Design a protein around this nucleic acid. Structure first.
Lengths: 96, 96, 95
RNA sequence: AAUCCAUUGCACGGAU
RNA sequence: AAUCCAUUGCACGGAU
RNA sequence: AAUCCAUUGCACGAU
């Protein structure tokens, strides 16, 4: 009923400022989130259905959990980050 | 009146999505909060003054504290959870 | 970058500007003192300082618990917006 | 049950 | 590219 | 003092 509550390698961030372009958004997300552990990748698209959102894929679940708990609601480009766990494993995680 | 930050066995959650019925709310709250320690009870009522709200009663204060620090603002049925400590001991805790 | 790096001081903005300084400082101490010892709470109502406060904790763990636990929580009908101070408070920098 | 009005409320309502 | 309109969206748009 | 306009700002105007 609430699979977005289940710890995952990947955190799902939405309510992101949609004026930020892909390169700056990924650089900023990497600078903020890398103190929680090794990031495998950050997935951002600016298409209609994907804007305002990012998937931050951590090597370790423990890093994802500490990232979500620490950065929940953080004011980022004038908007509080909204963070859940990804509903399903990112392909790069499932592949391992 | 300020948010209550004095630790207590019980956490008081509001800003809950009032479309979720009592039995599903309790089941979903149990699934989220059981990772912080042993839950003694979850009190939900749908009366006028009690809807949007839940009391989660932890066996140890340490579990409430971790629950509040970790799940504050968690996007739960499209609304960020607002978590304080309960102002006063729940009855199950008081007769202990 | 630095506003996301733990610091002794938390920076709060989006505060209800109608709250006067004494009640704001007393209310912020009641909220934040439960996370650990507070060295100081700096509030000014000047044009550039209003809607904002700096809460200086003795230990960084207190500031981290405070920011994580109270992020977004409504205060005088406005969600508190909490970051780490970009630079150490003078009282910390001196210590 | 459902839709609608109203309710942000610290505990152990109204309409079709 | 920019501007305006629309979009809060769980993945691996329209107009000058 | 109260109110209106303006200000979302990282410090150590009007009756």
């Amino acid at each position: 009923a609430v699979p977005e509550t289940r710890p995952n390698h990947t955190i799902y961030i939405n309510n992101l400022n949609e004026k930020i372009k892909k390169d700056e958004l990924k650089k900023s997300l990497h600078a903020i989130f890398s103190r929680f552990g090794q990031i495998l990748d950050i997935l951002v698209s600016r298409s209609l259905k994907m804007r305002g959102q990012a998937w931050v894929i951590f090597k370790e679940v423990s890093s994802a959990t500490n990232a979500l708990r620490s950065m929940q609601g953080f004011p980022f480009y004038d908007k509080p980050m909204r963070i859940q766990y990804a509903k399903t494993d990112s392909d790069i995680i499932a592949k391992m």
